[PDB]
Amino acid sequence: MATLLTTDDLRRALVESAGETDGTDLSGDFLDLRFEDIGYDSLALMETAARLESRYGVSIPDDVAGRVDTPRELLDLINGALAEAA
């Protein structure tokens, strides 16, 4: 059945990596947002992915992690790798 990331799962990654709700409101849907729009660098995106990567046992290239403009594609990317697992 696999284990995919919901809006809460990915939200936590962003929030926890940034700190603790530091203006980073990913409450509800945040897929149609942009990382620059929410004050994120790819550096934090690495950290975001890494925290999830470690739990789910996935691995995404740093260059690919720090390439997503929208949180949607970050979710899409990890869920893609999650589907590459079983």
Q: Which amino acid is at 60?
A: I
Contact 65, 35 (CB under 8 A): no
Q: Which amino acid is at 16?
A: E
| Structure-block tokens of residue 41 | 């660098």
What was the experiment behind these coordinates? Answer: NMR
Quote the CA–CA distance of 21 and 62 in Å, as a whole number. Answer: 24
Quote the CA–CA distance of 75 and 66 in Å, as a whole number. Answer: 13
Torsion angles phi and psi, residue 82, rounded to 5: -65, -35
**For the chain, which domains are there?**
1-86 (1.10.1200.10)
Burial (0-12, 13-18, 19+ Cβ within 10 Å), 76: middle
CA distances from 77 to 4, 19, 60, 61, 81 (A): 11, 23, 8, 11, 6
